[PDB]
Design a protein around this ligand. Sequence first.
Ligand code: CLA
Ligand code: CLA
Ligand SMILES: CC1=C(C#C/C(C)=C/C=C/C(C)=C/C=C/C=C(C)/C=C/C=C(\C)C#CC2=C(C)C[C@@H](O)CC2(C)C)C(C)(C)C[C@H](O)C1
Ligand SMILES: CC1=C(C#C/C(C)=C/C=C/C(C)=C/C=C/C=C(C)/C=C/C=C(C)/C=C/C2=C(C)CCCC2(C)C)C(C)(C)C[C@H](O)C1
Ligand SMILES: CCCCCCCCCCCCO[C@H]1O[C@H](CO)[C@@H](O[C@H]2O[C@H](CO)[C@@H](O)[C@H](O)[C@H]2O)[C@H](O)[C@H]1O
Lengths: 42, 180, 180, 35, 160, 168
Amino acid sequence: MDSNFLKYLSTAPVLLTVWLSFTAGLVIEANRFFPDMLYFPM
Amino acid sequence: EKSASVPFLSKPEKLDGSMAGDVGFDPLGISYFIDVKWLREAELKHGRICMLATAGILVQEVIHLPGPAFSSKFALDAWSTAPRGGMVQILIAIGLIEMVSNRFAITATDMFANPNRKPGDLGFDPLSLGANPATRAKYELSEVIHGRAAMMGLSGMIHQMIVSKQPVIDQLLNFKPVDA
Amino acid sequence: LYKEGSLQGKGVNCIPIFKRPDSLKGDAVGDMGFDPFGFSSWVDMNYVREAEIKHGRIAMLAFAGIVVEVLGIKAPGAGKILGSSTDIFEIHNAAVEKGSMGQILLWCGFFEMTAGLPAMQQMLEGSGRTPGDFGFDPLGLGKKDFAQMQIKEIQNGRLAMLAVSGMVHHALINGKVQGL
Amino acid sequence: DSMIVFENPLGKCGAYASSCHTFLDEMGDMLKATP
Amino acid sequence: VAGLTPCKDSKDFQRRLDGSVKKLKTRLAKYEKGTPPALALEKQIERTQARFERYGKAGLLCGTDGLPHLITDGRWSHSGEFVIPGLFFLYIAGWIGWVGRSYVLFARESDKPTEKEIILDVPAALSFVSTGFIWPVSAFKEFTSGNLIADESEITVSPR
Amino acid sequence: DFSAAVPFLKRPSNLDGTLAGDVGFDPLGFSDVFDLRVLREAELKHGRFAMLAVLGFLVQEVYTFPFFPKMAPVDAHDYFVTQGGGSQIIFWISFVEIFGVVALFELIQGKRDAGDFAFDPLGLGKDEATLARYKVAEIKHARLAMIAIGGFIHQFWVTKQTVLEQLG
Ligand code: CLA
Ligand code: CLA
Ligand SMILES: CC1=C(C#C/C(C)=C/C=C/C(C)=C/C=C/C=C(C)/C=C/C=C(\C)C#CC2=C(C)C[C@@H](O)CC2(C)C)C(C)(C)C[C@H](O)C1
Ligand SMILES: CC1=C(C#C/C(C)=C/C=C/C(C)=C/C=C/C=C(C)/C=C/C=C(C)/C=C/C2=C(C)CCCC2(C)C)C(C)(C)C[C@H](O)C1
Ligand SMILES: CCCCCCCCCCCCO[C@H]1O[C@H](CO)[C@@H](O[C@H]2O[C@H](CO)[C@@H](O)[C@H](O)[C@H]2O)[C@H](O)[C@H]1O
């Protein structure tokens, strides 16, 4: 891959968007498979 | 100029062939951005854990420790039936083992601070079987290939057990093709 | 090589349809210029020669066994335990049931692990052992013309491989190994 | 009272042509199957 | 029990469950059986019932309104309500802060720190992300070695 | 200049005849704006898929595996979509195409020849003359099979008849 294209992917807004989309997916899947968790189960 | 494992792709620059099991296999070029020392340490750890995992999945189906808690041929069921306090104890012991074996150098910034620290060399040789230079290279290659094979086997075992809902040996002896 | 240049060696082609690959250098016994796919370029010649000899020997023994089974010649007491069936597949299943084939497997594997594997490894590491050599000449039949015996063994083993394959498939089709 | 438990996995199964339907048995039956 | 009643045996909680299920069933009555709308509404009913049953068994306390209430005082019987979740947060947040600070220093000692801050060096960033898992001992080690807190005479301050 | 294939059309500038099967045919000038190497990789991937698809159609019509229901090649698609075998084939083709992406990037960088994956298991292309003849044959067959597979599928859709049965 072009090093310039990789730097463009490394730019701040692209990384922020990708990381926060990944985090949103993590939270969404956590709530999809383990929903309605108002508490830590003990 | 071309990788041995994948002829049409170029040889990975960071893979110089010094490491055991090096056939120039790095199509995605992880070694370019991740230190090969860290990568090999991770590879050996994964391979060792999966070696033990395959051995355990295959053995604890036939031989168990005494007790209803430990009596479970199905490994995923054993995960739940085994005493939870014992499992947490194993987790804590693994943490302490990591800490002491890595000598407080357990992060990507300090793991290989000591030049003497070599990838995957944690000072573990209780019987001193690795002191023979003639057999050391063969043992290293065997360890790497075993780790790779055990990783693949453990993954296959886990997911075939998810599918069949029966142990590995029990599945192979009473096979029932997947239906929905 | 026995009859070098006529029976085997460089410049010999059993099937002139396919050109003698340059990789076939006429140094190996049984080299009659047949390798259309050019495997000799990449394969390990000693390993593949040892494999050929092993396959040929097993095929020769298998031809003798299948033939004596179809002819109905049985050792004293074999019929009572296994049965009077002449079918090779039925005999195989019955022997597996009784435990004969299991013991044969155990001892063949023991011989492999203790003799063939170490011998093959040493040969491939450069011991200079001739492929397929185990020193098994108690009757001393090979002392007169060892090269002639070698070529005869290789050719007989190849023919026996083809014959055994044909016999098995004939038994599958017609129920007769002759497949007349 | 507290002893290691050895459970025989094989039972009465055989790699082929046995009472239990093994992986090899499945492959064979599929090869000889009729649509 | 503290000042309220367990939610597993509360008429208000049962009434809320009944109301939710009845709303869903009324919505379902107008859809043919086996159609995607009917399946979706049945799954909603199942999810509601599972949520209420799990809340009842969790040991949550419910007030007169019929809704679970949280006892965030330190009581160990209700740790899972605020404390353990709070510990998980603090762990993750300290991870984030520690790795961010490490990357800030790494970029500070570079040829172009501003370039490293707008166009990141993601190999080093991932390195720090990995390091972040023992941030408590690492942060305390930094503090005790004196690399964390700056001296009063080395920080710019406005005139009085 | 004028293309060899089309006397009245000017030879495309990028098409200098070096590549196999290059007869100067590019009326719409895709080579003018797109990388000829990338286009050739796409061409050969398409042609290989199409040739294997034609052979698969014929072999499926004559023979089907004992463990699979017997059916026309086109219907086999919709059947295996639900069965799950189509999912496996798609997944493994995607797995190979993941390395295909790396191969394409290397081609762009100028390390590889378009369509050259160093795949000669039987060593049939060792000598040059034969290799060039084989490359011309490969591109010719690729194009012919790309046409023929579309012909097969559309004819089946029209007649609802396998090609072997239609030919009689
Ligand atoms: C059961 C024991 C056994 C063993 C250990 C071997 C070993 C061997 N055989 Mg085999 N062989 C056996 C039985 C056995 N054979 C039997 C019963 C027959 C029929 C009578 C044959 C017929 C035969 C032929 C015709 C040929 C071989 C060949 C070989 C060699 C190459 C295979 C190899 O190295 O695989 C090792 C494995 C790998 C390299 C990687 C794959 C790993 C797999 C998946 C696991 C292997 C599990 C292991 C075999 C199980 C037993 C373990 C136990 C001994 C501790 C090797 C020396 C070939 C050769 O080149 O010979 C010189 C050959 O041509 N064998
Ligand atoms: C899902 C629930 C949830 C959500 C969405 C948030 C969201 C947020 N919390 Mg968090 N928080 C939660 C649950 C949640 N919290 C719970 C349950 C607790 C109780 C333990 C806290 C306790 C808490 C604190 C104490 C703080 C936040 C802060 C924040 C905000 C900034 C966090 C940040 O920048 O992290 C990225 C991390 C950093 C920038 C590093 C520095 C800050 C972290 C929090 C330090 C952690 C370690 C440190 C040693 C803790 C000392 C605490 C002590 C002084 C009390 C953010 C809006 C921060 C805030 O509002 O700041 C104005 C903040 O300081 N939260
Ligand atoms: C290092 C060292 C020491 C040591 C040591 C030790 C303890 C070494 C232990 C080594 C071990 C346990 C190695 C295990 C390897 C397992 C493998 C390769 C499994 C592969 C499975 C596969 C391919 C599979 C599969 C399958 C799947 C998935 C599908 C199934 O249907 C079929 C099947 C089952 C076939 C000691 C202590 C001596 C000290 C010394 O001084 C130093
Ligand atoms: C839809 C669908 C499917 C599908 C599908 C598939 C695989 C569909 C595939 C369709 C294909 C491959 C169509 C090809 C059309 C080719 C044409 C028109 C060529 C014309 C060439 C010409 C005119 C050449 C002319 C020539 C030129 C230029 C130069 C030389 C001279 C001349 C002869 C003039 C399934 C089967 C999976 C079913 C599923 O339910 C979904
Ligand atoms: C040897 C002295 C060491 C002193 C340091 C110990 C510090 C920390 C000890 C923590 C307490 C031990 O943890 C313990 O709690 C679990 C709670 O389910 C126990 O769980 C189980 O334990 C017993 C069997 O061992 C059973 O009779 C209990 O009914 C069962 O709850 C485990 O036995 C153990 O995991």
